[PDB]
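Appendix B: complex inputs.
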Amino acid sequence: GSHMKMSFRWYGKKDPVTLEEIKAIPGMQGIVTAVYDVPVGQAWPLENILELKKMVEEAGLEITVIESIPVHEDIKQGKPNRDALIENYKTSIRNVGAAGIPVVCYNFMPVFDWTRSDLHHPLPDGSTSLAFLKSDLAGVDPVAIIENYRQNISEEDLWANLEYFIKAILPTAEEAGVKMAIHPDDPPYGIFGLPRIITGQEAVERFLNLYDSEHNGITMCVGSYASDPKNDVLAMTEYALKRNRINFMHTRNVTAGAWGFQETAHLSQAGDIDMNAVVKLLVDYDWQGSLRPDHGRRIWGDQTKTPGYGLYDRALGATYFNGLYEANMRAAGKTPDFGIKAKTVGTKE
Amino acid sequence: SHMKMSFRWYGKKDPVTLEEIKAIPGMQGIVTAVYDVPVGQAWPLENILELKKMVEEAGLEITVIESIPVHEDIKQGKPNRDALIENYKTSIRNVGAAGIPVVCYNFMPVFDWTRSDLHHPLPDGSTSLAFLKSDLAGVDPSKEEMKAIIENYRQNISEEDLWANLEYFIKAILPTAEEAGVKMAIHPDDPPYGIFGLPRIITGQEAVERFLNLYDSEHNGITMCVGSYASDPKNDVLAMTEYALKRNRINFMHTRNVTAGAWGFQETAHLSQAGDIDMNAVVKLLVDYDWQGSLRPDHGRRIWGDQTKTPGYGLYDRALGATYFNGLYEANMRAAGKTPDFGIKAKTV
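Resulting structure:
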């Protein structure tokens, strides 16, 4: 039966936003984080991981998702030395299972993790936000790897590069008891001459099939998939739930059509995603995992640099999912839990 | 069946600005008062228009007026009351004379509310307002004038007197309010039971009916503050809310959360499982009855190093309140078949 742990992203010691503050978000249970002192491709030690955990748990919370044991471009590129990098991935996996963290979250997106044309695009209310202006700048080389991809490696070269990968790590993932969750490409389509393959329903279906197991699931990031209208998140989310292969939810809204795309407040009505439908769906399928609001607007004096990762609107995101998850739970004769063990401290009757 | 999510604003001197109040997803209405005519004297249109103007330019409207204060002398049924009830008559005239459809007021001797502690700690390390009975047991509440206003109430005004003093006031001002199109909504007493041997009468289901009945008319309404009434365990807010809804008698909604006991009470996060009120059931009611007027999340906790010193009127947890209600509303409207709505014209500029 259902079990959704409201979660927040936290970059660790050097985060603008603190655990004190994250904890104050009504219903917050999971911290979604990573090790940041180990170079990409290089293998996370247990101590790095337990350091983060000790901090997070003292704050009165738990790490429920490692967001991103990063994939070395060499691996993505399909270069001969991959196995070396892959064996390191296997260690990091083994190490996270060792810390008791249920899920690992990763992308297979070549040289770029995300693309945004404007980082302060105005919205109909004064708040800024990020957008992808299909017009602006677009159609210019970003000023060796890129040319490699552009020239040689096809999408199906990437499909085989990727299957090699997940075929290498999955048994390790299984023994650690860690659920992999592949993060869609963002935007979910070819740019810059680079290829993207994790982009829609057909790909989620081919990907899961790469290695048929729950240890091999997706991170349903509705705002990424829906950054291309060619995509319908609802049937995608459902297909994926019907199949038991969502291991992580992100839940940011986005407005889109043929013109490009722009991130908006989480509220279904502010963008093109019916967020109620999304969580109603998480409800009826007794989904068990974690959800993060993910990405916000710049509202108020918001001084967090690091892009959509300011506290305020992301917090205003979780409490909206609080209302959505709770109302839908009740509607179905289901009793919602938010992990509150005490209303008060020291008073009581 | 359209509920206009609103938010209280204190005029030009508020550290919370409308730029900020505007940025909360779905926020439409503002809730405000005039703060320069001393109390029982008349409210000049010059003073109200210039607040609407300040509001209407920021994208928001004035949806409801949080308090033209009834003067003590009116409440005490003193002889000089008619002069004061006069000014109050016009106050009602000027407000209708400026589009704003709801005036909210109270009938609570001596105090507008009483707490014992404005930084009581909660389990998540944040602080919130509490009223601890056992901590106000010791206390004995102009400064030398209040003394004998209390004495007057204590000794010479019984509940039934105060009921009669309210009766007068009501049939005095109620025609005026039907003549200006303004709807009166009375706040529950907070706490909803006597303290310091001072009477309170707007305290529960009984009071509601009797009050409603002084003037069986849709302009004679309550502000249904679930939190105020839920501060007494003896009360069933879900029943009281429904009761008042069948009579078309809700002219405003406050949706603050408390946890109560024989011990007193404390304000909590708006979220249900954090307090004692099932907000979902509340808004479900509001929905199931096609209610119309504005809802105001109330009293937020004190989180994220907020410094604003007014009661529970920082921006943050009040804002986290509102978008929790967005989610609770939306999810309920769809669970019915109705379609929700927020301030929302353009997704993008």
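The radius of gyration of chain B is 19 Å.
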